[PDB]
Every structure is written in C-alpha cells, then in structure tokens.
Design a protein around this ligand. Structure first.
Ligand SMILES: CC(=O)N[C@@H](Cc1cc(I)c(O)c(I)c1)C(=O)NCC(=O)O
Ligand SMILES: CC(=O)N[C@@H](Cc1cc(I)c(O)c(I)c1)C(=O)NCC(=O)O
Ligand SMILES: [Cu+2]
Ligand SMILES: [Cu+2]
Ligand code: NI
Length: 310
C-alpha cells in the first residue's frame, strides 16, 4: 500500500481514539513466497482496545497477512524474514487477512485489550509475498494493516483460544493420521464468533467442537488448504465451565518419504485451530491454550464430518 511519508503512522480520530498504520518499510521481495515481518511498539503505555482493522495490501503481490500482539518481537530490525522468528514470547494472533477470503469485522462493542501492565506492548506484522511479477520495477512495498485503538473500555473483550498439537508423528506414506486435541473448559463463559485453521501441506481437514453432556456442537470445520482467514462461525456458540473443547486435524503421509512431525518448516506440520471469542469485560481473559488430549476416548463419538474432506 502507499507509503505514509511525512505524516507518520498515527492518525488522531478524536479525544480517545487513533488509527495506527502498521506497514512494511518499503520492502522489495526478491524470491516468490517471501515472508516478511516487522513490529511497532504501541505509542501509548496505558491500556487501549483494538476495535477495528482495515487491510492495506497490494492485491498484485500480497498473498496473506497476519497481525500479532507480543512483548518481545524476534528481531530489533526494521524488518526481517519471519523464518528467523515472530516473537520471543508467545505471540497472540489478532488478525489474518487472506487474499482470496475477505476478513470479517469485529462485532461492535468488542475489543482486544493491549498495552498497559499485562497487554501486548508490540504489534508484529507478517506479510507473505506470493507473486512478485510486479517487483521487476524494484518498487518497494508498504502493504500492511491499519488498526483502530481507543482508551474507552469495551463491554466485550476479544480473546483467542488456541488448540494445537505438539506430539504428532506422520509416518511416510501413511494414508490417514489423526491429531486429536481436547481440554476441559474452566473459565467464565466465552462466545466463539470466528475461527482460523492452520496446517501445512499434509492437512486434509481441521475441525473443532464444544462437547457438553456427550453432545458435539460444531465450532468450525475447514480445509486447511483453502485461504487461512478467520471465518465467522455458523452460529454463535458459548463454551462454559465443564465443557470440553475437542479438535482433530486429519493428515496424510502420502508423498513423504520420511516421517513428518510437528514443527516450523514446510517439511514439518502443524495442527492449529484458533477460536476467536468474546467475554464480558469483568470476566475476561485474553488467551487460552490447549496442547493436550484429556478425553482421548471421547473421540470415538466424533461426528463423521470430522474425517470427511470439505
Ligand atoms: C508449533 C505450532 O503449532 N505453532 C503454531 C501455533 C502457535 C501460534 C501462536 I500466535 C502461538 O503463540 C503459539 I505458543 C503457537 C503456529 O505458529 N502457527 C502459525 C499460523 O497460525 O499461521
Ligand atoms: C473518527 C473515526 O473513528 N473514524 C473512522 C475510524 C478509522 C479511521 C482510519 I484513517 C482508520 O485507518 C481506521 I482502522 C479506523 C471510522 O469511523 N471508521 C469506520 C469504519 O470504516 O469502520
Ligand atoms: Cu499466504
Ligand atoms: Cu505453520
Ligand atoms: Ni450465548
């Protein structure tokens, strides 16, 4: 997107609001499939709320973008190749923009809490450059995301419940390998409103469910090879203390001559189901994670859609 120049990245909106533009510093991708990252310290130290996001991406080159909040970006640079790392600490994903799947807006009254004593101090943007035909000009790119911040406390706080595998091993040639994840929910109620799935090339399908009284309620189901944007949930789903969140990624070993385990490269795999939710401000926590399988046997009753591609 157009580089800002002399006006800088901060646009005052009114007494308590401002837009912060998070753009690449005029970079020029040299290889296709390049992944660039950069970070912006928040301008204010006190707590603020991110209530909106507007993509500022060049359609001819940018394939996808992801925006995280964290306290220690992986590089002190102007920008860097993300394969070096995103954040030293555990990054919280806030937004994903996919070229072929237009992002959905946050419900009004819902905001991510950042800054202050416990909120993220930085935003780290990762841009994935696919086609670079437009880059023979050796033109620089300032694609990114604009974020709307406010000091006004929001009634509903947005958070992320991340379900991910750590132990998965996919034997070469192996027709079907399931990665099951399950945890019991023990916090105040959350209402899922969006979900994103993430797998590398071996993933066939990823599904997540809320299981209450043995009954399975679909949160989201998606083919991880389709654009990995946050998609709105079919129907609002609350998860309450006692419920169990269960997820399954279906992989294959077909095509691999060696075993594939969980990891950060293209030769590795990942099984992630991001569940974006909102909670009443007075009960809210911004992030939860599940990296276990507490009810392995429970999957004997998983809906068949969980094994059939989409
Ligand atoms: C090892 C793995 O599966 N990593 C995933 C999930 C992940 C993401 C964030 I944000 C975290 O803070 C943590 I802890 C783990 C991963 O990096 N996925 C990237 C993606 O979703 O595209
Ligand atoms: C005064 C105000 O809030 N104006 C905009 C907010 C805004 C402005 C810019 I410049 C941004 O880049 C972003 I992110 C958000 C407003 O009312 N936007 C409505 C909307 O499109 O959602
Ligand atoms: Cu991409
Ligand atoms: Cu990955
Ligand atoms: Ni409800």
């Amino acid at each position: 997107n157009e580089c800002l120049g002399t006006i800088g990245p901060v646009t005052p909106l009114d007494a308590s609001d401002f837009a912060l533009d998070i753009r690449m510093p005029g970079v020029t991708p040299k290889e296709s499939d390049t992944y660039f990252c950069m970070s912006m310290r928040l301008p204010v130290d006190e707590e603020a709320f991110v209530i909106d996001f507007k993509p500022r991406a060049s359609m001819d080159t940018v394939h996808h973008m992801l925006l995280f909040g964290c306290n220690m970006p992986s590089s002190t640079g102007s920008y860097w190749f993300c394969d070096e790392g995103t954040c030293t600490d555990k990054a919280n994903i806030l937004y994903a923009w996919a070229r072929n799947a237009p992002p959905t807006r946050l419900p009004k009254g819902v905001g991510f809490r950042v800054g202050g004593e416990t909120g993220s101090k930085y935003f780290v943007l990762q841009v994935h450059y696919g086609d670079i035909s437009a880059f023979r000009d050796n033109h620089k790119d300032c694609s990114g995301v604009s974020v709307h911040l406010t000091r006004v406390p929001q009634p509903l706080i947005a958070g992320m419940y991340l379900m991910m595998s750590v132990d998965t091993v996919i034997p070469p040639g192996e027709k079907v390998v399931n990665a099951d994840i399950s945890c019991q929910y023990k916090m105040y109620p959350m209402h899922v409103f969006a979900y994103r799935v993430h797998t590398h090339h071996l993933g066939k399908v990823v599904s997540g469910y809320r299981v209450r009284n043995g009954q399975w309620t679909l949160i989201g189901r998606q083919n991880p090879q389709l654009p990995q944007a946050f998609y709105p949930v079919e129907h609002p789903v609350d998860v309450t203390f006692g419920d169990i969140l269960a997820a399954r990624c279906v992989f294959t070993g077909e095509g691999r001559t060696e075993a594939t385990h969980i990891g950060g490269t293209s030769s590795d795999e990942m099984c992630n189901l991001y569940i974006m939710y909102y909670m009443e401000a007075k009960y809210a926590l911004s992030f939860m994670t599940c990296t276990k399988n507490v009810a392995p046997d429970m999957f004997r009753t998983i809906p068949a859609e969980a094994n059939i591609p989409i």
